[PDB]
Each structure stands twice: as C-alpha cells, then as structure tokens.
Design a protein around this ligand. Structure first.
Ligand SMILES: *[C@@H]1O[C@H](CO[C@H]2O[C@@H](C)[C@@H](O)[C@@H](O)[C@@H]2O)[C@@H](O[C@@H]2O[C@H](CO)[C@@H](O[C@@H]3O[C@H](CO)[C@@H](O)[C@H](O[C@@H]4O[C@H](CO)[C@@H](O)[C@H](O)[C@@H]4O[C@@H]4O[C@H](CO)[C@@H](O)[C@H](O)[C@H]4NC(C)=O)[C@@H]3O)[C@H](O)[C@H]2NC(C)=O)[C@H](O)[C@H]1NC(C)=O
Ligand SMILES: *[C@@H]1O[C@H](CO)[C@@H](O[C@@H]2O[C@H](CO)[C@@H](O)[C@H](O)[C@H]2NC(C)=O)[C@H](O)[C@H]1NC(C)=O
Ligand SMILES: [Br-]
Ligand SMILES: [Br-]
Ligand SMILES: [Br-]
Ligand SMILES: [Ho]
Ligand SMILES: [Ho]
Ligand SMILES: [Ho]
Ligand SMILES: [Ho]
Lengths: 391, 391, 391
C-alpha cells in the first residue's frame, strides 16, 4: 500500500490526518514544516570601500625640465608644470625658458579602514534548498530533511515515508547582490573594471588584501599656487560614502513571500513557496484529513501609513474576534495589492499587522484572514526623493 | 478517506474524473483552471523622458570680468569668454582699455511633456501568484482560489476539497523592467545617477513631480559668434527619443509559455507552468480518470516567415483534420526549436497558427498537435540591424 | 481506479514499485528519468570581437586650409592641423610665411577575423523544459516525454499513465548571457550602444555581417612628427582580447544542481530540481513501493584543494565501503557549504569526488552519502587577483 499526498511548504500551517487503520486505537498523524534554507552560491566579484588619495613628495626642478612617463598605479596621474612660482636657489640660475618645471603626481589606494568596513559584491545563484519537517506520528516525533535535489526515504513509527523533492526552489536573491554588514542588497553593481567616480564601486578590488586595485575617482592635477610648494588637485568624494546614504532599505525587510534574510552564511529562510509531497504504506481508506482552523469574524482593515511604488511601503492592521488562538493564512484578492507575509498568528487580543505593496496611490483591495474577508481603502504618498550626487 | 491528485496549471486543458461511488447516480467531477495572475512588486527606481534645455540671460559684459561659480542646477555648465567684437559699444558705457567679456551658461530640466509621456523603470520581483479554478462537481459549479503562498481548503458539494499550493511560480519578468505605455520591457536600464547622453536614461528623476532631476546630456558651451549676442552650445538629441526607435518589441508578445502580459496593475496572466494538487474524501476506488482528446490526423507544418536569433521570430502553421472541435496541446520534440504557446484550439476548419523560436538559420524540428506529429523545415534570416546612435 | 504518485526529477535515482494486483504473477514497475532539456529563448543582442583600426592616406594641404565635416563611420574622427604643415621635403610647399594645414582622420571596423572568432551576447529566458522518462512495466519498456507546459497521457502495458506537468523549471542561465565558443557565461554585458574602451563590448554590432557597427576605442588623433608624413594616434588595445584573459571560468563547470551545459542549441541538461507526478488505473492497494539503496559505512571526508568565495572552488573526496555497487544521493547538512552534484555513483572501489562551495575560509560541514554522514574540515584560500586593465 502506498498513499500519496502533499503538504504546503509554509512554516506553521500544519498537515493533520486522522489515520483510522482497522485494527484498533486510531493514529493521529501530523507533519509540518519548521524551517527552510535556501543558500545561493556567492561568487565574489569584488569589494569596494572608502578610498585614500596618495600624493608623494613633489619634484622641484629647474628649466632643465623633465617629463613624466606613466607607471601602474590606481587612477595614477602626473603632469609636468612649465613656469611655476618665483623663488630660487643661488640667484635664479635655471634660465632656459619655462623658469621652473614641476613634476606633480598622485594615485589611489583603498583607505586603511576597508579591512573592517567594506561592502561586497557577489554574483549569486541558487545552490540548494532544504527544509526541516517535524512529523508527529501517533506517539512518536521525528524530524526529517527534505530537498529539491532529490527525494528522501525514511522509516518512522514502523511506517515507511518518502518525502518527494520540493516542488520548486524560489529565491528572493537576484543574480547580482551586495553584502554590506548584516544587510543584503539586490544591486546591478557596476562590473569589475568599470567603476565610476562618486558612485558605488569608486574603487574596486577582488579582496581587501588583493593586489588588483582599480579606481576611477576622477583625480585631476591642478597647477601649483605661488607661495609654499604643494600638490593641488580635484577629486570626487568617496562614492562609497555616497552609496551609504543612497542605497535604500535592504532586502532583509523587503523579501517577498514572508521570506527571511540572514547574513553569516547568506541565505533565505522560511520562504513560503511550493509544496512537499509525501507517501506511506497505508490505503487511502485508512486516511482522513483533518482541517481545524480558527474561526474568525468581525474583520476590519485599517491602513496606517502607505508609500506609493516601493517594495511593501504600506502597513495594514486587522482588528477581529477569534474563537481559538491559532495561526491563519493571509491573502489579497485584488491584483492591485500584494501582501508580504503569507501567514499570521491569531491571538485572542485581536491585533494583526501586515505589510502590503501596491503601485497605485489610493488603492482599494480586499485582504483575508483565514476564511474572513475585509476591505482596505487608503491613500499613499509617492516614493522619497533620491539623493542627487555630485552635481 | 483522502484521495490525492494533481491537475495541470494550464488554462483550458481540463481534468475530468468519473467518480463512481457505490451508492447510486455516478458523479462526473471536472475542474479546470480559468485564469492565472502573477503580480510582481514593482519598486520604482526612476523615470525618464524628453529633456528640455535651458539657457538663462547672457551676462553681457564690457569693462569687467564677471567670473562664474557652480550653480546646483542639473548638469550646470558655465564658461566665460573674451570676444563678441562686432562692435556694439559706444564708449559712454564702456570706455575700457581692455577687451570684451561674456559669461554664458545653461542647465537642464525635463520637458513639459513628461507628465503625459514618460517611461518608468521599476525593479520587480514576484510578489504572489494565484489562480482561479472552476470545479464542476456533478450538478454544482464553484470557483476556488488557489495560491503558492499556502494551500486552501474548501467544501463543495458536501465533499471536502483542499487545493494544495501551486507547484511553482514562474515569472516572465526580469528583476529590472521598464513600463512605457501599455508596453512592458525587460531592460537592464542604467542605474539612477548613471545615465548617459543620447541613450535611455538621458535624464532621470524618481518621479515626474520629483525634485532630484539628474541629467547628463553632454551640454557643451560654445563661444559666441560676432553679431547678435546669444548662447551657442552643443548637446545630444534626447536619448529618450532615441530609445523610442531602438527598444525592440515588448514582452507583451515575446512572453514564453503562452504567458500574457497586462499593464494597469502589471502582471502576467495564464502563464502555463506547473501543477495544482488537490485532495478529497473519496477512495481511489470510486475515482477513475477520463481523458477524451480530439483525435487529429494528416498533420502538416508550413513555416511562413522566420527570423534568426530573436524571441519567437518564426511562425508555423499547421493544417489538419479533426474528428471533434476541441483544445489540444502543442509541443516541440527538438531542442533546436521552442514553441511560444503551449496549447491551441482545434477547430474543424483545419488551421492553427503557432509562434516558434530558434537560433539556427535553417532548422528542422518536429511540432506536435495532441498525439499527432509533423516535421517543419524552414530557412530564417538574421536579426534586423540595430539603430546606430549619435556617431 | 486512479493511484497518484510522484517521482524525483533526478537522472539516475529510480522509482521502483511492486504492483501486486490480485490475479496472479506480480508486476514490478520501475520508471526513472534519463535526460532533461531546458532550452532558453536566446535573443541575440549583439556580438563583439577584435577590432581593426583604419586610417586612410592623409591630406597634405597648404595655407589654403580646409575644414573636415563629419561622416558616418564607427568612432569616426578628423582634425584640421594648423601649422603642423610638416614643412619641407623637396620643391615648394606653402610659401605663406604663416601656416598651412593637415586633414588627419581615422575610424574603426571589426577585424577581418570576427567571422571565425567572436563572442555573442544573447538575452535568454527559459522557453521550455522537457524530460525523458523510461518506464519499465513488467516485461515492457517504453520512453515517455514529460513537460512543464502541460501534462501527457499515454497508455503502456494496457495500463493508462498520465505524467502530470513537471513541478518547476529551474534554469542555471541568467537573463543575460554570452556564448563564445563551446563556453557559456553569465555576464551583465554592457548594452548595445554602450560599450567602453578596453573592455568587453569594445565594438558592437548585431551580427558579423551586420551594418550597424558601433565602437568606442578611445581613438585619439596625435599631431604629426617632423620627417615622413604619417598618421599618429592613441587607442586602447582590443577590449575583446582583454576579456579573453579576464572572463573567469564558464558556466559549463559552475552550474549548480548537477546541471550540465551544452552549446550547439544552448541548453541545460539533467538539471536536478523538482518532481514528476504520475497516475495510473490501479488501487493504492495493489501498489507497494520498493526502496533498495546501497548500504555504505566507514565514511570519510578529505578536502584536497579549496578556494574561498568562488562558485564551487572546493573539492571533497569521500572514501568508504559499500555492500553493492549502485547510485547514491549526496547532500550537505550545513548551510555553510553547498554541493554541486546531487548524486554520485557508488563503486566498490571506494572513491567519490564532489565539488563543494562556501564563502567561509576554514569551514566545517557535514557531507552525506545516502544514509551515511561524515565531517569535512578544510582551510580555503581567497579568490585569485583580477587582471587590472589599461591603468
Ligand atoms: C511532539 O511535538 C509536540 C509539539 O511540538 C511543538 O514544539 C514547539 C516548541 C514548536 O516547535 C511547535 O511547532 C511544535 O509542534 C510536543 O508537544 C509539546 O509539548 C510541550 C510540553 O508539553 C509543549 O510546550 C510547552 O507549552 C506550554 C503551553 O501549554 C508552555 O507553558 C511551555 O513553556 C515552558 O517550556 C519549558 C521547556 O523549554 C519548561 O521548562 C518551562 O517550565 C515551561 O513549561 C511549563 O512549566 C510550567 C511551570 O512553570 C507548567 O505550569 C506548564 O504546564 C509547562 N508547560 C508545558 C506543557 O510544557 C512549553 O512551551 C507544546 O505546547 C506541545 N505541543 C503542542 C501544542 O501539542 C510533543 O511532546 C512531541 N512529542 C515528543 C515526546 O517528542
Ligand atoms: C457548470 O458549467 C457548465 C459549462 O461547462 C454549465 O453548463 C452550461 O449550461 C447552459 C444551460 O444549461 C448551456 O447553454 C451551456 O452550453 C452549458 N455548458 C456546458 C458545456 O455544459 C453549467 O450550468 C454549470 N453548472 C451550474 C452552475 O449549474
Ligand atoms: Br559584473
Ligand atoms: Br539599478
Ligand atoms: Br541589455
Ligand atoms: Ho554638484
Ligand atoms: Ho545590469
Ligand atoms: Ho553620428
Ligand atoms: Ho596601465
């Protein structure tokens, strides 16, 4: 005997069957997902951080003017200045035109702070997704691992179980991301040797200790000002600093489908998409599903704040009355609005907060809490102004 | 009793079971998908449109040397010259010993037409996918909603149904799109402050009414021409206009898997990918599936026009003979060619048009109509020439 | 009667049921996947290759100076050089005791070698995914095709089979790729008219025989050097050549989930993600699944070489003892490490090599071979240094 089924891939909402096998005492099977880990394969492209300008001591020369070649230094520059500031040794000896040539030069190197303050630009692709399912068969509790890259057969309670491959493997991570501290961003970060001044990627290197530093800060050598010889130049404030102010909110809180982002190994947790098929040694006869959901009534929607076209810029609040504290499912029956989370715990208190998203100022959608519906009407403000860069 | 099954996620091709429950009258269950809505979470990055050049009043100098600073306007440009020597003096105003001077300047602002003619660049990620399934149980017809972010239990006809989570949620939308009018494009549009002259994103601002206008039109101040003082300059014709001619065909007609694009709320409809699992209170004994497909013969393929390496640039036409007007499935058994639609209605007329795609000039694939096969042989022309920009 | 099930979408690991239909001789059903083809819809954006500089013969002129307009040529340039009149050579060339003029010009065109040595930049999106399943019903062997864009009903052995739509359609290809020879890369290649000098896309054209050549090699006209008239200029070595050295490893060996890349028609094979649901005319009573996996013990992990943050830069080697040569499944129970392949053949020899990936120098994960586990401890070196471009 082999009975096949399929449970939802959502952490929380359980599967509860009432296995009444003709012999005696009836078993109460119950398996639910408790975790979901989708780790991508980060392929570090490069890292960027505040830069540091470096200008060595200048070469004071006479009319015996020199000409600077070109070395291999990040954004390296050099300019021979003909005819600069009246001062001299001996009694103005040079002579031969120009009066005084100046060999000014300066290049770039990543700030001494990169080590403990830099962002990373990885190229990630979903590598594997596994989930932990806790099955409570009668008087036995066991946790099984389920993947996408293959099924998994296990024997629990003297019964054979086979948790077929997860239907799909959805990822909230794009193919190009940027990891800063504990934050993760989905940015189409400029390629390696393609950074632009005053913008993310101002300077670029494979790693902090790397030796392939690339920069493009628009370092421009200026002509010396009479008085005390020094090296004047124009640049463009650390794009990295600029990015810090620009870069919006992280994925950490904009992840769809209730997906939760984490940073150390970098992964998406409890992402709610799909189903997990199972099968056992029992006739579809002994099987009988149980569906006991918290009955709720007097639903009421109330939108506090809401922002126009921005990943979940709205905030809905549902008031209600329940008969039993539990865990309900939330949905939107209007394509004009989308819900971030896909579930919410229902407490007898009567307060549920959800984040929604829409691109229509003044939208009118209908949210749902289990089997109850309610309308939401709100007026949203357009997205914040950007932070204009060096104009 | 709980019997589990799974129907295809394609609008049209139905599921038909013959439930012969030993009791009396045999029931004829039939459930099929009728719609599919996958809405993404657009996160407006910026919008662009035809720009408008602006030139302030020219600083008609004379006996002075007014120098210019750096205003905060969009891509400000200021240059001061020493000419305009047609004459124009008089002496009573400028009895100077030195020659003339003139400070010309200009900046940019989005054309007065952006309001009702601009494109938008959103950053979208699949937010939710739901489908409408019409189940016709015996003498009862009911429509149920099914999602990915959770299952859904419903009671219909005194029988309990549970439409498990949709297998997967495929999206034809990339992570960076551009919405123009009723069209949608998959473009890796340049980032915010990174627009280039004569190219899409010439100018950029969060919103039309925004106040963070960014531009890079390569505005260059030219030296005045003797005669009537004015402000000469070089620029680069509105990249936006250029984009209009460049930007190929929209996704609206290149969407794979028969997916249909829509614009107001922005979503993909009837996308045909996946399956929808269900379960009821009935033994696998009373259940018996029915599969009555239109039998077709004398299949014949004929390729009219075909373009090389371009999203569905070919057009196949199948002639045939059917026994009953119905709805068949179309497939390609040769990796060298791919079919856009995944289904086609079979009329007794005998004419079916399909769009195919391949990257091989002179390909030889085998299309299929239900259970019938036929070969297709055609010779394709390479893709159209691009529209070279300001050379 | 209709019994539903679901088998894993992995080429190799089979499905084996023991159909004991009360009548007589027991049938041994066994169906397993043998291939998987996911072809995308490449939409050729443009191709690039080594460029060729072109400077025609110069126009030796007198003080009767000419002025060069502007033609339509790739990166076309021209500059009228005043008093650059090389001066002297034989007879009389411009007696005007002032200055003559030099009309120098040069443009670009793709090297004569593009035809048989160029890369291609396509814009690809999953078009269709089909799999070949070999079902061995009793004393009959038949191969059925299964897709995502629809189900498929077939009759084999006098029994009706319906292979529902594949759960999902995962693709290792991004939305922007580059095909070179037999290699495929996932590169966010610069758009059409947006190429940069000394970088991939130096020059760009829809096709090799195209007539929309675009270039941006930073061609700069230099002033002639006294002696033998010629045309001096500065450029930037073929970005294409640079790309050749830069472009890391191809997808061909970094494809996740054991996916295998191919080049002629361009597709991903045996990608191991998902499940394939089936159903027949038999009670869940006659059905009984069989799971006979090779029992292995004395597992031992040994990491040879390992590279930091790079798509599968590590190499694990498992030693062991088996009871029967077979085919096991490999997994990682530590989010800090991911396995490339999702299966491995188990020979009595005792040697299994796997590629893993992690972003943590000095990681400690636990790999698995069927039902056996083992720890892996290794220390990895950071990613190679990039290849700094024209500094
Ligand atoms: C099979 O799994 C069942 C359910 O597993 C759930 O586990 C949780 C943690 C989540 O993962 C869920 O998603 C899983 O479904 C097991 O049944 C559970 O059994 C435990 C204990 O009986 C229940 O947990 C308790 O719930 C009560 C509420 O009734 C809490 O008050 C209680 O809090 C504390 O727990 C710690 C343990 O870390 C105690 O040290 C602490 O003192 C306190 O316990 C309470 O102590 C006070 C005295 O101060 C006493 O008055 C309370 O009676 C005592 N509470 C109890 C009953 O523990 C804790 O969270 C859990 O609710 C049950 N699940 C349900 C709702 O069915 C089952 O045991 C597993 N089978 C086996 C044996 O493996
Ligand atoms: C369920 O849907 C069917 C359509 O498939 C409805 O049947 C239609 O009935 C009307 C009048 O009896 C006819 O004009 C149509 O041709 C029928 N369609 C077909 C093909 O059956 C049926 O009424 C619905 N069930 C309900 C709500 O009673
Ligand atoms: Br890149
Ligand atoms: Br962007
Ligand atoms: Br592009
Ligand atoms: Ho500025
Ligand atoms: Ho990009
Ligand atoms: Ho041009
Ligand atoms: Ho260089």
């Amino acid at each position: 005997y082999e009975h096949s089924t399929v449970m939802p891939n959502v952490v929380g909402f359980p599967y509860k069957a009432h296995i009444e096998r003709p012999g005696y005492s009836p078993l109460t099977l119950q398996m639910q997902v408790v975790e979901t880990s989708l780790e991508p394969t980060l392929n570090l492209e490069y890292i960027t951080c505040e830069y540091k300008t470096v200008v060595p001591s200048p070469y004071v020369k006479c009319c015996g003017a020199s000409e600077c070649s070109t070395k291999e230094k990040p954004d390296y520059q050099c300019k021979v200045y003909t005819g600069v500031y009246p001062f001299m040794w001996g009694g103005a000896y040079c002579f031969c035109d120009s009066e005084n040539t100046q060999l000014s030069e300066a290049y770039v190197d990543r700030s001494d702070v990169c080590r403990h303050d830099h962002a990373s630009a990885y190229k990630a692709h979903t590598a594997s997704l596994k989930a932990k399912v806790r099955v409570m068969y009668g008087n036995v509790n066991q946790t099984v691992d389920v993947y996408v890259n293959g099924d998994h057969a296990v024997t629990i309670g003297g019964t054979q179980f086979i948790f077929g491959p997860l239907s799909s493997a959805w990822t909230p991570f794009d193919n190009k991301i940027v990891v800063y501290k504990d934050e993760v961003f989905n940015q189409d970060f400029p390629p390696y040797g393609s950074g632009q001044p005053g913008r993310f990627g101002d300077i670029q290197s494979r790693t902090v200790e790397s030796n392939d530093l690339y920069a493009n800060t628009a370092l421009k050598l200026a002509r010396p000002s009479p008085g005390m010889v020094h090296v004047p130049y124009t640049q463009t404030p650390s794009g990295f600093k600029y990015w810090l102010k620009e870069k919006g909110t992280a994925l950490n809180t904009k992840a769809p489908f209730g997906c939760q982002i984490k940073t150390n190994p970098v992964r998406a947790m409890n992402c709610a998409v799909g189903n997990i098929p199972v099968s056992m040694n029992l006739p579809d006869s002994a099987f009988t599903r149980i569906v006991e959901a918290p009955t709720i009534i007097d639903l009421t929607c109330t939108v506090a704040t809401c922002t126009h076209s921005s990943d979940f810029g709205g905030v809905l609040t549902l008031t209600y009355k329940t008969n039993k504290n539990g865990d309900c499912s939330v949905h939107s029956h209007s394509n004009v609005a989308t819900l971030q989370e896909a579930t919410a715990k229902v407490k007898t208190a009567g307060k549920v907060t959800l984040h929604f998203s829409t691109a229509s100022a003044s939208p009118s959608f209908v949210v749902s809490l289990c089997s109850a519906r309610a309308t939401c009407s709100a007026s949203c403000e357009p997205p914040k102004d950007h932070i204009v860069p060096y104009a």
